[PDB]
RNA sequence: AAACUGGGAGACUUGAGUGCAGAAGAGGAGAGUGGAAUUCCAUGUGUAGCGGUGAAAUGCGUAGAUAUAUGGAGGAACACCA
């Protein structure tokens, strides 16, 4: 439907999870996934393999509506950010841009206590 | 008695200040202003999780969360320079 054939992948990868949503060239979302929505639990949600299969479960649906063009904007200073890409290309999509979008404050707000573990 | 310390009348320019000619600086007080980010709000797309740990649970979520796009509101601190 809508035979968009263009869009941009958003990767949001923290220390203990990983989300990949694929939306079109502007806003409105088409298909998403995350490691939790694949039965994984707890620790394992941060290994790259989780990002592998989540990228797959998103692509497989995004190209069930016609899609080649995609870019990659990676938030999320975590680990599996590149495994997400390697699964994004090698199951059909047409990656052509990588960019980093990490919020960097110019010293505005105060962060929480340091943990004494 | 008259070297030294004290007192009295003077004299001097090296200490101390003044004039003239220049230099650097997150020194202080007042009044405006900028962008990055966090929170909340409004609206579109959007399906079942998100968040968190050494592992879990409490918490938020099908009164449509998280994500994602555009617009507003307020406060505090000023990345690189260093």
Author numbering: 13 to 129
Q: What did the published study say regarding this structure?
A:
In the analysis of the E. faecalis 70S ribosome structure determined by cryo-electron microscopy (cryo-EM) to a global resolution of 2.8 Å, we find that structural differences are located predominantly in peripheral regions, while the organization of the functional centres and antibiotic binding sites remains conserved.
Structure determination by cryo-EM using multi-body refinement produced molecular maps that reached 2.8 Å for the 50S subunit, 3.0 Å for the 30S body domain, and 3.2 Å for the 30S head domain by gold-standard Fourier shell correlation. These maps were used to generate models for the 30S head and body domain and the 50S subunit. In the 16S rRNA, larger structural variations are located in solvent-exposed and peripheral sections of the beak (rRNA helix h33a), the spur (h6) and the body (h7, h10 and h44). Gentamicin binds near A1492–A1493 in the 16S helix 44, restricting motions in the ribosomal decoding centre, which contributes to misreading and interferes with translocation and ribosome recycling. In Supplementary Fig. S8c, the superposed RNA backbones for the E. coli and E. faecalis structures are almost indistinguishable, indicating that antibiotic binding would occur in a similar fashion.
